[PDB]
Structure formats: C-alpha cells, structure tokens
Amino acid sequence: MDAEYDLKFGMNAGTSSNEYKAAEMFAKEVKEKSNGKIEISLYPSSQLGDDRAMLKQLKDGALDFTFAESARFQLFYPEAAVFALPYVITNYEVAQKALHDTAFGKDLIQKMNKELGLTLLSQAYNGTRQTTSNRAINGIADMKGLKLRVPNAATNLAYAKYVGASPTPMAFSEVYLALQTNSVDGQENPLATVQAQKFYEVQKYLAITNHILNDQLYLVSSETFADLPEDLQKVVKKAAQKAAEYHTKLFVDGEKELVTFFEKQGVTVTHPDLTPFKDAMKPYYAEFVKQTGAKGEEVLKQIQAIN
Ligand SMILES: CC(=O)N[C@H]1[C@H]([C@H](O)[C@H](O)CO)O[C@](O)(C(=O)O)C[C@@H]1O
C-alpha cells in the first residue's frame, strides 16, 4: 500500500503560481492512476537551486521531474536561443510547432535525452513576458537607464541591452527584495508571475511589451523513466499531457483578466508603441546569426516557414 516510487519534482515557481497548481494536478493524477504506486513530492521556490541546477540533477538521478523552457537549452545548443529572441515567436501555436514540427526541434528533443538525460513529457504555455517598473514606460525612450533585472539568460540580457536599459542579472528568488529596496528599477515576467510573486506590491507601473513568449516543458529524468514499467510510463505521460493542458489554460485565461486585476491594485498600465521595440531588436537578430552561423540561419528559416 506504500508507494513503490517516491519521486521528486523541483521548480523555481512558488507555491502561489500556476506552475505549482499544474504540478499539483500532475502529482495527483499520477498517484491516482498508478493506484498509489507513484508518489510525487514537490520542491518549489528554488529550494533545490535554479532551473540550470535542477536540470543537472535530473541527469545525475537526484531529482526526477522539473520544468524548463525550450529556450533554456541555448546554454548547450546556442542556436536554441531562437525560441527567445524577442518578438520572433509571436504566439503559442508557433512555439508548439517550433519544438515539435521542425527538423531542429525534433533534433533538440533527441539531444536532450541522449546528451542531457532528459525525457520530454509535454509542453505548456507559460505566458508572454511584460515589463514592470517604478516609473512609467510610455515608449522605448523611457527604457534608457532603467535598471532592469533579468534572469541569468542571454536572451533576457539582450532584450534589456538592445532597448537601452541597464541589465542586472539575478536569480528569481532574489527579485522581490531587490525591487523592495530599489536596488533595481524594474523586471520582466509574464503577468501571472507578477501576480504570483506579488511584484505589484513593489512596482507601480506595468508596460505591455510582449517581448518574449515562454513555454514550459514537463521533463523527467530519462533514468527514472526507464526504470518505470511500460504501463506506469504511460500513466506518467498521460498525466503530464493533461496537466499541461490545464497549465496552458491557467495562463491563457489569466491574460484576459490580469491587467484589470493590477489596475485594481493601483498599478498604472501602459501600452507603448511596440514598433520601435521590434526595430530595436533587428541588430540583435543580426548578431545572433553572426555568432551562430549557418546553424542559426537555418533555425530562423525553419521557424519562419511556420504559418
Ligand atoms: C522553468 C523556469 O525555471 N522558469 C523561470 C524562468 C527561466 O529561468 C528563464 O526565463 C530562462 O529560461 O525565469 C523566471 O521567469 C525569472 O527568473 O524571471 C522565473 C521562471 O520560473
């Protein structure tokens, strides 16, 4: 009657987040549908490290499940930065097809398993990133000199650089206190994350910059997964796909309602003209291609071929 597999799921997201809620549904489904044989415990709030660290732990066996964006694999395969080049992926359906229907995406999935020890269970939408700050962003000119926190990720650094801001990389866990103490001026994250982390308590302004679309991959250690029998492998996979659908809904539904939530909290929302933002990224696309060469040019081609 005790569990036969005691598995662990680590995440940066906190206990108020859509990601945690969907992870909870995943653990419930797996426990139910395995008839008790699998129990998944959750380790949120970066208590095990950030997402780079948890990825390594899945490879080493010490952690069984985690989340990652397609774009995070730019750390290992630099052309994979295409997923997060600002304004390139314009909606979630493209993000699905970029990963699953392109030669490059399909090859990335195989390398994740053979080289990184990761098996992909499902993909979700994790929102489109927006920009909060302690002063109004009425146009790109207001970004100049803004001390903008970004995650430890080259594409986020590059958004900040190319719009004129002063980037400050730092881990997710440290942002609330950095905004509270105004050691940084702003940050950038999907709207649902601004809510979950209560960044609206320490940011008076929100700008709809739509600059980077985030997905979320449900990952399992390939070692852990291969040790499960085939019928429990199917359980885990079906549970991951159900959870991912719920995960996407949480974020889609929130993007219809969260701007007015923040206005009720007294945040001032702006909708700057995005053509100068998009223009400001054209040099960055040029530099991506210079750095990644033939490979980067081909992934950009495969992604443009998606309607
Ligand atoms: C799966 C995951 O860990 N996502 C985290 C991402 C990625 O680390 C980053 O976008 C680079 O891929 O950054 C955050 O948005 C952030 O620190 O602001 C928190 C979010 O939980």
Side-chain angles (χ1 to χ4, degrees):
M1 293 306 107
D2 288 303
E4 171 177 8
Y5 306 93
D6 292 305
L7 307 186
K8 310 176 135 202
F9 196 142
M11 65 194 84
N12 280 310
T15 57
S16 302
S17 65
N18 293 340
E19 297 96 312
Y20 185 75
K21 288 178 178 62
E24 284 187 308
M25 156 181 306
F26 175 62
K28 177 184 180 69
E29 276 296 315
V30 168
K31 188 181 194 173
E32 182 189 311
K33 297 290 193 299
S34 70
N35 195 24
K37 288 191 154 283
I38 307 168
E39 223 161 277
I40 302 177
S41 303
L42 305 186
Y43 298 82
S45 319
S46 311
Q47 63 188 272
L48 304 177
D50 72 350
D51 47 342
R52 300 176 287 181
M54 282 177 287
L55 290 177
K56 295 175 190 213
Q57 293 167 20
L58 260 68
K59 190 159 172 303
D60 305 334
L63 179 69
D64 304 290
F65 300 94
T66 204
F67 288 133
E69 300 159 10
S70 290
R72 197 51 147 166
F73 293 97
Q74 75 189 276
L75 291 169
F76 314 104
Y77 316 110
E79 66 280 15
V82 68
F83 291 112
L85 293 175
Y87 303 106
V88 169
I89 308 271
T90 49
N91 67 58
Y92 178 55
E93 202 203 56
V94 176
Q96 294 177 294
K97 292 181 182 188
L99 176 63
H100 287 105
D101 297 349
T102 66
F104 145 73
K106 291 170 194 284
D107 178 75
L108 176 62
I109 294 164
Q110 293 304 298
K111 289 194 295 194
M112 270 160 57
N113 177 37
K114 309 190 262 83
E115 297 182 5
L116 296 178
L118 310 171
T119 292
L120 173 63
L121 294 175
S122 62
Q123 174 189 45
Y125 179 58
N126 218 79
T128 304
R129 304 182 80 99
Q130 312 297 347
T131 310
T132 73
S133 57
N134 59 7
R135 53 186 178 73
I137 304 315
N138 303 120
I140 195 170
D142 296 308
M143 299 292 297
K144 198 71 60 68
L146 187 77
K147 285 191 279 304
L148 181 62
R149 178 270 169 177
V150 296
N152 291 290
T155 34
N156 300 81
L157 273 173
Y159 168 65
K161 178 193 181 301
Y162 282 101
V163 298
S166 299
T168 305
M170 61 176 91
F172 192 52
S173 62
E174 308 307 292
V175 177
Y176 188 99
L177 189 69
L179 299 171
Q180 189 184 65
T181 60
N182 282 290
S183 67
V184 286
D185 292 331
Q187 67 75 69
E188 52 80 49
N189 257 302
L191 295 174
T193 301
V194 172
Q195 176 179 51
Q197 297 289 120
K198 294 182 292 175
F199 292 156
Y200 62 93
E201 293 176 346
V202 290
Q203 300 278 262
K204 295 314 76 153
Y205 296 90
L206 167 78
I208 304 308
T209 52
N210 297 328
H211 53 279
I212 294 170
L213 188 153
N214 289 150
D215 70 346
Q216 207 84 344
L217 309 181
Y218 284 65
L219 302 172
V220 64
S221 168
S222 302
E223 188 186 292
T224 298
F225 197 70
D227 181 66
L228 295 172
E230 190 167 359
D231 68 310
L232 290 184
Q233 279 169 12
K234 196 166 186 180
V235 170
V236 166
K237 188 140 185 50
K238 282 192 71 180
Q241 293 283 8
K242 176 167 208 203
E245 287 203 358
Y246 174 62
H247 191 135
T248 292
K249 186 188 167 53
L250 289 175
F251 277 92
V252 168
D253 288 357
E255 282 178 347
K256 299 305 265 193
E257 188 269 339
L258 278 173
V259 170
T260 56
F261 171 82
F262 292 124
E263 291 174 313
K264 192 257 196 313
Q265 303 304 316
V267 172
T268 300
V269 188
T270 64
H271 298 79
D273 185 5
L274 297 191
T275 296
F277 285 74
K278 291 179 189 187
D279 284 357
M281 294 303 121
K282 285 165 175 177
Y284 177 44
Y285 304 155
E287 189 61 22
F288 172 73
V289 172
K290 281 176 187 152
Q291 290 288 93
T292 67
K295 277 154 96 82
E297 184 164 299
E298 187 49 51
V299 303
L300 269 178
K301 184 182 172 194
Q302 279 172 46
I303 290 205
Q304 138 87 51
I306 298 155
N307 302 309

Coordinates of all heavy atoms in Angstrom, one line a residue, residues 76-147:
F76 N 23.4 25.0 -24.0 CA 24.1 23.8 -24.5 C 24.1 23.9 -26.1 O 25.1 23.5 -26.7 CB 23.4 22.6 -24.0 CG 23.1 22.6 -22.6 CD1 21.8 22.8 -22.1 CD2 24.1 22.4 -21.6 CE1 21.5 22.8 -20.8 CE2 23.8 22.4 -20.3 CZ 22.5 22.6 -19.9
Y77 N 23.1 24.4 -26.7 CA 22.9 24.4 -28.1 C 22.6 25.9 -28.5 O 21.4 26.3 -28.4 CB 21.9 23.4 -28.6 CG 22.0 22.1 -28.0 CD1 21.1 21.7 -27.1 CD2 23.1 21.3 -28.2 CE1 21.3 20.5 -26.4 CE2 23.3 20.1 -27.5 CZ 22.3 19.7 -26.7 OH 22.5 18.5 -26.0
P78 N 23.6 26.7 -28.9 CA 23.4 28.2 -28.9 C 22.3 28.6 -29.9 O 21.7 29.6 -29.7 CB 24.8 28.7 -29.2 CG 25.7 27.7 -28.6 CD 25.0 26.4 -28.9
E79 N 22.1 27.8 -31.0 CA 21.1 28.2 -31.9 C 19.7 28.1 -31.3 O 18.7 28.7 -31.8 CB 21.2 27.3 -33.2 CG 20.9 25.8 -33.0 CD 22.1 25.0 -32.5 OE1 23.0 25.5 -31.9 OE2 22.0 23.7 -32.7
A80 N 19.5 27.4 -30.2 CA 18.2 27.3 -29.5 C 17.8 28.6 -28.8 O 16.7 28.7 -28.4 CB 18.2 26.2 -28.5
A81 N 18.7 29.6 -28.8 CA 18.3 30.9 -28.4 C 17.2 31.4 -29.3 O 16.4 32.3 -28.8 CB 19.5 31.9 -28.4
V82 N 16.9 30.8 -30.4 CA 15.9 31.4 -31.3 C 14.5 31.4 -30.6 O 13.7 32.3 -30.9 CB 15.8 30.6 -32.6 CG1 15.2 29.2 -32.3 CG2 14.9 31.3 -33.7
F83 N 14.2 30.4 -29.8 CA 13.0 30.4 -29.1 C 12.7 31.7 -28.3 O 11.6 32.1 -28.1 CB 13.0 29.2 -28.1 CG 12.9 27.9 -28.8 CD1 13.9 27.0 -28.8 CD2 11.8 27.5 -29.5 CE1 13.9 25.8 -29.3 CE2 11.8 26.2 -30.1 CZ 12.8 25.4 -30.0
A84 N 13.8 32.4 -27.9 CA 13.5 33.5 -27.0 C 14.1 34.8 -27.6 O 14.1 35.8 -26.9 CB 14.1 33.3 -25.6
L85 N 14.6 34.8 -28.9 CA 14.9 36.1 -29.5 C 13.6 37.0 -29.4 O 12.6 36.5 -29.9 CB 15.3 35.9 -30.9 CG 16.6 35.1 -31.2 CD1 16.8 34.9 -32.7 CD2 17.8 35.8 -30.6
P86 N 13.7 38.1 -28.8 CA 12.4 38.9 -28.6 C 11.7 39.1 -29.9 O 12.4 39.4 -31.0 CB 12.9 40.2 -28.0 CG 14.1 39.8 -27.2 CD 14.8 38.8 -28.2
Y87 N 10.4 39.0 -29.9 CA 9.4 39.2 -30.9 C 9.5 38.3 -32.1 O 8.8 38.4 -33.0 CB 9.5 40.7 -31.5 CG 9.3 41.7 -30.4 CD1 10.4 42.4 -29.9 CD2 8.1 41.9 -29.8 CE1 10.3 43.3 -28.9 CE2 7.9 42.7 -28.8 CZ 9.0 43.5 -28.3 OH 9.0 44.4 -27.3
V88 N 10.3 37.2 -32.0 CA 10.4 36.2 -33.1 C 9.2 35.2 -33.1 O 8.6 35.0 -34.1 CB 11.8 35.5 -33.1 CG1 11.7 34.3 -34.1 CG2 12.9 36.4 -33.5
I89 N 9.0 34.6 -31.9 CA 7.9 33.7 -31.8 C 6.7 34.5 -31.3 O 6.8 35.1 -30.2 CB 8.2 32.6 -30.7 CG1 9.5 31.8 -31.1 CG2 7.1 31.6 -30.6 CD1 9.3 30.6 -32.0
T90 N 5.7 34.6 -32.1 CA 4.7 35.6 -31.8 C 3.4 35.0 -31.2 O 2.6 35.8 -30.7 CB 4.2 36.4 -33.1 OG1 3.9 35.4 -34.1 CG2 5.3 37.3 -33.6
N91 N 3.3 33.7 -31.1 CA 2.1 33.1 -30.4 C 2.5 31.7 -30.0 O 3.5 31.1 -30.4 CB 0.9 33.2 -31.2 CG 0.9 32.3 -32.5 OD1 1.1 31.1 -32.4 ND2 0.8 33.0 -33.6
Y92 N 1.7 31.1 -29.1 CA 2.0 29.8 -28.6 C 1.9 28.7 -29.6 O 2.6 27.7 -29.5 CB 1.1 29.5 -27.4 CG 1.3 28.1 -26.7 CD1 2.5 27.8 -26.2 CD2 0.2 27.2 -26.6 CE1 2.7 26.5 -25.7 CE2 0.4 26.0 -26.0 CZ 1.7 25.6 -25.6 OH 1.9 24.4 -25.1
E93 N 1.1 28.8 -30.6 CA 1.0 27.8 -31.6 C 2.3 27.6 -32.4 O 2.7 26.6 -32.8 CB -0.2 27.9 -32.6 CG -0.6 26.6 -33.2 CD -1.3 26.8 -34.6 OE1 -0.8 27.5 -35.5 OE2 -2.5 26.3 -34.7
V94 N 2.9 28.8 -32.7 CA 4.2 28.7 -33.3 C 5.2 28.0 -32.3 O 6.1 27.3 -32.8 CB 4.7 30.2 -33.7 CG1 6.1 30.2 -34.2 CG2 3.7 30.8 -34.7
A95 N 5.1 28.3 -31.0 CA 6.0 27.7 -30.1 C 5.9 26.2 -30.0 O 6.9 25.5 -30.0 CB 5.9 28.4 -28.7
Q96 N 4.7 25.8 -30.1 CA 4.5 24.3 -30.2 C 5.1 23.8 -31.5 O 5.8 22.7 -31.4 CB 3.0 24.1 -30.2 CG 2.3 24.4 -28.9 CD 0.8 24.2 -28.9 OE1 0.1 24.9 -29.6 NE2 0.3 23.1 -28.2
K97 N 4.8 24.4 -32.6 CA 5.3 23.8 -33.9 C 6.8 24.0 -34.0 O 7.4 23.2 -34.7 CB 4.6 24.5 -35.1 CG 3.2 24.2 -35.2 CD 2.5 24.8 -36.4 CE 1.0 24.5 -36.4 NZ 0.4 24.9 -37.6
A98 N 7.4 25.0 -33.4 CA 8.8 25.2 -33.5 C 9.6 24.0 -32.8 O 10.6 23.6 -33.3 CB 9.3 26.5 -32.8
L99 N 9.0 23.6 -31.7 CA 9.7 22.5 -31.0 C 9.4 21.1 -31.6 O 10.3 20.3 -31.7 CB 9.3 22.5 -29.5 CG 9.8 21.4 -28.6 CD1 11.3 21.4 -28.5 CD2 9.1 21.4 -27.2
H100 N 8.1 20.9 -32.0 CA 7.7 19.5 -32.4 C 7.7 19.3 -33.9 O 7.8 18.1 -34.3 CB 6.4 19.3 -31.8 CG 6.3 19.0 -30.3 ND1 5.8 20.0 -29.5 CD2 6.7 18.0 -29.6 CE1 5.9 19.5 -28.3 NE2 6.5 18.3 -28.3
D101 N 7.5 20.3 -34.7 CA 7.3 20.1 -36.1 C 8.5 20.5 -37.0 O 8.3 20.4 -38.2 CB 6.1 20.8 -36.6 CG 4.8 20.3 -36.0 OD1 4.8 19.3 -35.3 OD2 3.8 21.0 -36.1
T102 N 9.6 21.0 -36.4 CA 10.8 21.3 -37.2 C 11.9 20.3 -37.1 O 12.0 19.6 -36.1 CB 11.3 22.7 -36.9 OG1 11.8 22.7 -35.5 CG2 10.2 23.8 -37.0
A103 N 12.7 20.2 -38.1 CA 13.9 19.4 -38.0 C 14.7 19.8 -36.8 O 15.1 18.9 -36.0 CB 14.7 19.5 -39.3
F104 N 14.9 21.0 -36.6 CA 15.7 21.5 -35.5 C 15.1 21.1 -34.1 O 15.8 20.6 -33.2 CB 16.0 23.0 -35.6 CG 16.0 23.7 -34.4 CD1 17.0 23.6 -33.5 CD2 14.9 24.5 -34.0 CE1 17.0 24.3 -32.4 CE2 14.9 25.2 -32.9 CZ 15.9 25.1 -32.0
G105 N 13.8 21.3 -34.0 CA 13.1 21.0 -32.8 C 13.1 19.5 -32.5 O 13.4 19.1 -31.3
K106 N 12.9 18.7 -33.5 CA 12.9 17.3 -33.2 C 14.3 16.8 -32.8 O 14.4 15.9 -32.0 CB 12.4 16.5 -34.5 CG 11.0 16.7 -34.8 CD 10.7 16.1 -36.2 CE 9.3 16.6 -36.7 NZ 8.2 15.8 -36.0
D107 N 15.3 17.4 -33.5 CA 16.7 17.0 -33.1 C 17.0 17.5 -31.7 O 17.7 16.8 -30.9 CB 17.7 17.6 -34.1 CG 19.1 17.4 -33.8 OD1 19.5 16.2 -34.0 OD2 19.9 18.3 -33.3
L108 N 16.6 18.7 -31.3 CA 16.8 19.1 -29.9 C 16.2 18.1 -28.9 O 16.8 17.8 -27.9 CB 16.2 20.5 -29.7 CG 16.2 21.1 -28.3 CD1 17.6 21.3 -27.8 CD2 15.4 22.4 -28.2
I109 N 15.0 17.6 -29.2 CA 14.4 16.7 -28.3 C 15.2 15.4 -28.1 O 15.4 14.9 -27.0 CB 12.9 16.3 -28.7 CG1 12.1 17.5 -28.6 CG2 12.4 15.2 -27.8 CD1 10.8 17.4 -29.3
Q110 N 15.8 14.9 -29.2 CA 16.7 13.8 -29.1 C 18.0 14.1 -28.3 O 18.5 13.2 -27.6 CB 17.0 13.3 -30.5 CG 15.9 12.8 -31.3 CD 15.2 11.6 -30.7 OE1 15.8 10.6 -30.5 NE2 13.9 11.7 -30.4
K111 N 18.6 15.2 -28.6 CA 19.8 15.5 -27.8 C 19.5 15.7 -26.3 O 20.4 15.4 -25.5 CB 20.4 16.8 -28.4 CG 21.1 16.6 -29.7 CD 22.0 17.8 -30.2 CE 21.2 19.1 -30.4 NZ 22.0 20.1 -31.1
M112 N 18.4 16.3 -26.0 CA 18.0 16.4 -24.6 C 18.1 15.1 -23.9 O 18.5 15.0 -22.7 CB 16.6 17.0 -24.5 CG 16.5 18.5 -24.5 SD 14.9 19.2 -25.0 CE 13.8 18.4 -23.8
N113 N 17.6 14.1 -24.6 CA 17.6 12.7 -24.0 C 19.0 12.1 -24.0 O 19.5 11.7 -23.0 CB 16.6 11.8 -24.7 CG 16.6 10.4 -24.3 OD1 16.8 10.0 -23.1 ND2 16.5 9.5 -25.2
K114 N 19.6 12.1 -25.2 CA 20.9 11.3 -25.3 C 22.0 12.1 -24.7 O 22.9 11.4 -24.1 CB 21.2 11.1 -26.8 CG 20.1 10.4 -27.6 CD 20.6 10.0 -29.0 CE 20.3 11.0 -30.1 NZ 21.3 12.1 -30.1
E115 N 22.1 13.4 -24.7 CA 23.1 14.1 -24.1 C 22.8 14.7 -22.7 O 23.7 14.7 -21.9 CB 23.5 15.3 -25.1 CG 24.0 14.8 -26.4 CD 24.4 15.8 -27.4 OE1 24.4 17.0 -27.0 OE2 24.6 15.5 -28.5
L116 N 21.6 15.1 -22.4 CA 21.3 15.7 -21.2 C 20.5 14.8 -20.2 O 20.1 15.2 -19.1 CB 20.5 17.0 -21.5 CG 21.3 18.0 -22.2 CD1 20.5 19.3 -22.6 CD2 22.5 18.4 -21.4
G117 N 20.2 13.6 -20.6 CA 19.5 12.8 -19.7 C 18.1 13.2 -19.4 O 17.5 12.8 -18.3
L118 N 17.4 13.9 -20.3 CA 16.0 14.4 -20.1 C 15.1 13.8 -21.1 O 15.4 13.8 -22.3 CB 16.1 15.9 -20.3 CG 17.2 16.7 -19.5 CD1 17.2 18.1 -20.0 CD2 16.9 16.7 -18.1
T119 N 13.9 13.4 -20.6 CA 12.8 12.9 -21.5 C 11.7 13.9 -21.4 O 11.2 14.3 -20.2 CB 12.3 11.6 -21.0 OG1 13.3 10.6 -21.3 CG2 11.1 11.2 -21.8
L120 N 11.2 14.4 -22.5 CA 10.2 15.4 -22.6 C 8.8 14.7 -22.6 O 8.5 13.9 -23.4 CB 10.3 16.1 -23.9 CG 9.1 17.1 -24.3 CD1 9.1 18.2 -23.2 CD2 9.4 17.6 -25.7
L121 N 8.0 15.1 -21.6 CA 6.7 14.5 -21.4 C 5.6 15.4 -22.0 O 4.6 14.8 -22.6 CB 6.4 14.4 -19.9 CG 7.2 13.3 -19.2 CD1 7.0 13.4 -17.7 CD2 7.1 11.9 -19.7
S122 N 5.7 16.7 -22.0 CA 4.7 17.5 -22.5 C 5.2 19.0 -22.5 O 6.2 19.3 -22.0 CB 3.4 17.4 -21.7 OG 3.8 17.9 -20.4
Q123 N 4.4 19.8 -23.2 CA 4.7 21.2 -23.4 C 3.5 22.1 -23.0 O 2.3 21.7 -23.4 CB 5.2 21.6 -24.8 CG 5.4 23.0 -25.0 CD 5.7 23.3 -26.5 OE1 5.0 22.7 -27.4 NE2 6.7 24.1 -26.8
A124 N 3.7 23.2 -22.3 CA 2.6 24.1 -21.9 C 2.9 25.5 -22.4 O 4.0 25.8 -22.8 CB 2.3 23.9 -20.4
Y125 N 1.9 26.4 -22.3 CA 2.1 27.8 -22.3 C 2.4 28.4 -20.9 O 1.6 28.1 -20.0 CB 0.9 28.5 -23.0 CG 1.0 30.0 -23.1 CD1 2.0 30.6 -23.8 CD2 -0.1 30.8 -22.6 CE1 1.9 31.9 -24.0 CE2 -0.1 32.1 -22.8 CZ 0.9 32.7 -23.5 OH 0.9 34.1 -23.7
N126 N 3.4 29.2 -20.8 CA 3.8 29.8 -19.5 C 3.7 31.4 -19.6 O 4.5 32.1 -18.9 CB 5.2 29.4 -19.1 CG 5.3 29.2 -17.5 OD1 4.8 28.1 -17.0 ND2 5.8 30.1 -16.8
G127 N 2.9 31.9 -20.5 CA 2.7 33.3 -20.6 C 3.7 34.1 -21.5 O 4.7 33.5 -21.9
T128 N 3.3 35.3 -21.8 CA 4.2 36.2 -22.5 C 4.7 37.3 -21.6 O 3.9 37.9 -20.8 CB 3.4 36.9 -23.7 OG1 2.9 36.0 -24.6 CG2 4.3 37.9 -24.3
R129 N 6.0 37.5 -21.6 CA 6.6 38.4 -20.7 C 6.3 39.9 -21.0 O 6.2 40.3 -22.2 CB 8.2 38.2 -20.7 CG 8.6 36.8 -20.4 CD 10.1 36.5 -20.3 NE 10.7 36.9 -19.1 CZ 11.0 36.0 -18.1 NH1 10.5 34.8 -18.2 NH2 11.7 36.4 -17.1
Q130 N 6.1 40.6 -19.9 CA 5.8 42.1 -19.9 C 6.8 42.7 -19.0 O 7.6 42.0 -18.3 CB 4.4 42.3 -19.3 CG 3.4 41.4 -20.0 CD 3.2 41.7 -21.4 OE1 3.7 42.6 -22.0 NE2 2.5 40.8 -22.1
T131 N 6.8 44.0 -18.9 CA 7.8 44.8 -18.2 C 7.2 45.7 -17.1 O 6.4 46.6 -17.4 CB 8.6 45.7 -19.1 OG1 9.1 44.9 -20.3 CG2 9.9 46.4 -18.4
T132 N 7.6 45.4 -15.8 CA 7.2 46.3 -14.7 C 8.3 47.2 -14.3 O 9.5 47.0 -14.6 CB 6.7 45.5 -13.5 OG1 7.9 44.9 -12.9 CG2 5.7 44.4 -13.9
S133 N 8.0 48.3 -13.7 CA 9.0 49.3 -13.3 C 8.4 50.3 -12.2 O 7.2 50.3 -11.9 CB 9.4 50.2 -14.5 OG 8.3 50.8 -15.1
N134 N 9.3 51.1 -11.7 CA 9.0 52.1 -10.7 C 8.7 53.5 -11.4 O 8.5 54.4 -10.7 CB 10.1 52.3 -9.7 CG 11.5 52.6 -10.3 OD1 11.5 52.8 -11.5 ND2 12.5 52.5 -9.5
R135 N 8.8 53.5 -12.7 CA 8.3 54.7 -13.5 C 7.7 54.3 -14.8 O 7.9 53.2 -15.3 CB 9.5 55.7 -13.7 CG 10.7 55.1 -14.3 CD 11.9 56.1 -14.3 NE 13.1 55.5 -14.9 CZ 13.3 55.3 -16.2 NH1 12.4 55.5 -17.0 NH2 14.5 54.8 -16.5
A136 N 6.9 55.2 -15.3 CA 6.1 54.9 -16.5 C 6.9 54.6 -17.7 O 7.9 55.4 -18.0 CB 5.1 56.0 -16.7
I137 N 6.6 53.6 -18.4 CA 7.2 53.2 -19.7 C 6.2 53.5 -20.8 O 5.4 52.7 -21.1 CB 7.7 51.8 -19.9 CG1 8.7 51.5 -18.7 CG2 8.4 51.5 -21.2 CD1 9.8 52.6 -18.5
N138 N 6.1 54.8 -21.2 CA 5.2 55.2 -22.3 C 5.8 55.0 -23.7 O 5.0 54.8 -24.6 CB 4.9 56.7 -22.1 CG 4.3 57.0 -20.8 OD1 4.9 57.8 -20.0 ND2 3.2 56.4 -20.5
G139 N 7.1 54.8 -23.8 CA 7.7 54.4 -25.1 C 9.1 53.9 -24.8 O 9.6 54.0 -23.7
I140 N 9.8 53.4 -25.9 CA 11.1 52.8 -25.7 C 12.1 53.8 -25.1 O 13.0 53.4 -24.4 CB 11.5 52.3 -27.1 CG1 12.7 51.3 -26.8 CG2 12.0 53.4 -28.0 CD1 13.1 50.5 -28.0
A141 N 11.8 55.1 -25.3 CA 12.8 56.0 -24.7 C 12.8 56.0 -23.2 O 13.9 56.4 -22.6 CB 12.3 57.4 -25.2
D142 N 11.8 55.6 -22.6 CA 11.8 55.5 -21.1 C 12.5 54.4 -20.6 O 12.7 54.3 -19.4 CB 10.3 55.4 -20.7 CG 9.5 56.7 -21.0 OD1 10.1 57.7 -20.6 OD2 8.4 56.6 -21.6
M143 N 13.0 53.4 -21.4 CA 13.8 52.3 -21.0 C 15.2 52.7 -20.8 O 15.9 51.9 -20.1 CB 13.8 51.2 -22.1 CG 12.5 50.6 -22.4 SD 11.7 49.6 -21.1 CE 12.9 48.3 -20.8
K144 N 15.6 53.9 -21.2 CA 17.0 54.3 -21.2 C 17.5 54.5 -19.7 O 16.9 55.3 -18.9 CB 17.3 55.6 -22.0 CG 18.7 55.9 -22.4 CD 19.3 54.9 -23.4 CE 18.5 54.9 -24.8 NZ 18.7 56.3 -25.5
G145 N 18.5 53.7 -19.3 CA 18.9 53.9 -18.0 C 18.1 53.2 -16.9 O 18.4 53.3 -15.8
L146 N 17.0 52.5 -17.3 CA 16.2 51.7 -16.4 C 17.0 50.6 -15.9 O 17.5 49.8 -16.7 CB 15.0 51.2 -17.0 CG 13.9 50.6 -16.2 CD1 13.2 51.6 -15.5 CD2 13.0 49.8 -17.2
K147 N 17.1 50.4 -14.6 CA 17.9 49.3 -14.0 C 17.0 48.1 -14.0 O 16.1 47.9 -13.1 CB 18.4 49.7 -12.6 CG 19.6 50.6 -12.6 CD 20.2 50.6 -11.2 CE 19.4 51.6 -10.3 NZ 19.4 52.9 -10.9

